[PDB]
Amino acid sequence: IKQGIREVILCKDQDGKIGLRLKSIDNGIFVQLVQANSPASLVGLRFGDQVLQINGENCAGWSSDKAHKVLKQAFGEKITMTIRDRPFERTITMHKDSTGHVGFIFKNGKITSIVKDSSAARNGLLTEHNICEINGQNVIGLKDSQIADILSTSGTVVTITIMPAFIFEHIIKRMAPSIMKSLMDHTIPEV
């Protein structure tokens, strides 16, 4: 996770979509979903990002509905959002053994045990943390099998963005785990 507040400027697509779902957490507004191909993905919005401001209005204390309401009335052309980078998340860098193992177990995207004498051990991978990204590639909602694929077919350096499970659960609440799989931006970033 980055350390800074960043400005992003957005343009509603031809259907008046930005590609975002927002969720109220601890009187903040956090990113619950980024739609593949949306304007939100183009400006590089990410699951777990904080929206501090929309059009230079503070989001402090908004309902999930008021956030979504506010968005539906922006002057179309230009939306300024002030973003804090994935404040509930952390990144661990690990190195597979010759066997191609970073050295942990997961289930429903959640780390459940660390294997003794491993890179995951050596780097202090925590259990009870959900996998959010892998080499900066969002993987939330992909079946456990597909997350393993990405680990196999990655390089010897693996970079995992994790979230404490209690906070992960509180964010995805009220979004059935098939829209998680279906329409959450899983694509590598464009340039």
Judge whether 15 is annotated as a binding position. Answer: no
* Cα-based distances in Å from 189 to 13, 17, 33, 45, 109: 18, 19, 15, 10, 21
**Cβ neighbours of 50 (radius 10 Å):** 19
Judge whether 108 is annotated as a binding position. Answer: yes
Joined together, the tokens standing for residue 144 give 């456990």
Integer Cα distance of 150 and 31 in angstroms: 24
Judge whether 143 is annotated as a binding position. Answer: yes
Integer Cα distance of 114 and 120 in angstroms: 6
Q: Which residues are annotated as a binding site?
A: 108, 143-144
